[PDB]
Structure 1
Amino acid sequence: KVFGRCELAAAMKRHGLDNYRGYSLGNWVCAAKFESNFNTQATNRNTDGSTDYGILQINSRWWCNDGRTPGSRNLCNIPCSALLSSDITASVNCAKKIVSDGNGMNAWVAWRNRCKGTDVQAWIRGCRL
């Protein structure tokens, strides 16, 4: 599923991401935009052989099991394919664990390079939330 901007904001808001660990909704929409272009089916392979999955590009090195990342962890206790669903619940619940682990949203390279310190509120402007 390829989300609309406001559609995804409302979905994320419903799942408790607005101001989660102090990160306003615009941060999450901005990260999703640049990680996946709002596409729940996005996958990308990393150089160490791990793979990033879904709308927030969550990494099989630590967070999910794809059966092909030897020596990795599965800290969200889910198959990585569950992160590709049109229902964002699994991605959001795993993202809550990631952002709580000490490093905040800096775990998302695109958020660090393209959203952090920008006016992220513009990503939810005009949306009915």
Structure 2
Amino acid sequence: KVFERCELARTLKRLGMDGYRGISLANWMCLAKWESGYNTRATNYNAGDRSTDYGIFQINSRYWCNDGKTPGAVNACHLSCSALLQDNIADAVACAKRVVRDPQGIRAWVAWRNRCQGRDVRQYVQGCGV
């Protein structure tokens, strides 16, 4: 599924992401936008290390989900990576929360650092009623 901007903002709010571990809803929006274009079925293979990024937040298989084909990987979210490709983003959100529970927090995603950190991200939630 490819979410509409405000549709996703309300969906994320309902899932308890607004201010999760100090991260505003606008930041999560900026993250999903740059990571996948709000596309839950987006996948990205990293030929360089044999891992794959899955779903709306493009979560990596080396540490977060299990896909059976990533060398010496773990599964912190304790989910099949398939779970990160559903139209229903409840599991992906649960996993994203797990990711930010680590020290880096939202900084875990380099794209967030490049296109969200230190910027005016209000635009992502404007008019959404969140």
- Indicate whether the TM-score tops 0.5: yes
Q: Distance in 2 between matches of 1:54 and 1:122?
A: 23
* Number of the residue aligned with 2:63: 62
Q: Secondary structure at the match of 1:44?
A: strand
Q: Distance in 1 between matches of 2:70 and 2:59?
A: 13
* Number of the residue aligned with 1:13: 13
Q: Distance in 1 between matches of 2:103 and 2:122?
A: 24
Deviation string, structure 1 residues 69-121 (Cα, Å, up to 9, x no partner): 02100110000011000000010000101001110111111111000111112
* Number of the residue aligned with 1:37: 37
Q: Secondary structure at the match of 1:51?
A: strand
After the TM superposition, list the runs of 4 or more consecutive aligned residues in structure 1 that deviate by more than 2 angstroms: none
Aligned residues: 129
Give the counterpart letter for 1:10 in structure 2.
R
Q: Secondary structure at the match of 2:106?
A: helix
Counterparts of 1:1-129 in structure 2 under 5 Å? 1-46=1-46, 47-129=48-130
Q: Distance in 1 between matches of 2:108 and 2:129?
A: 29
Q: Structure 2 stretches of 5 or more lacking a match?
A: none
The alpha carbon displacement at 1:45 in A equals 1.0
The alpha carbon displacement at 1:128 in A equals 2.2
Give the percent of matched residue pairs that are identical in Structure 1 and Structure 2.
61
- TM-score w.r.t. the length of structure 1 is 0.98
Give the counterpart letter for 2:50 in structure 1.
G
Q: Secondary structure at the match of 1:98?
A: helix
Q: Structure 1 stretches of 5 or more lacking a match?
A: none
Give the counterpart letter for 1:119 in structure 2.
D
Give the counterpart letter for 1:125 in structure 2.
Q
RMSD of aligned residue pairs (Cα, Å): 0.7
Give the counterpart letter for 2:89 in structure 1.
I
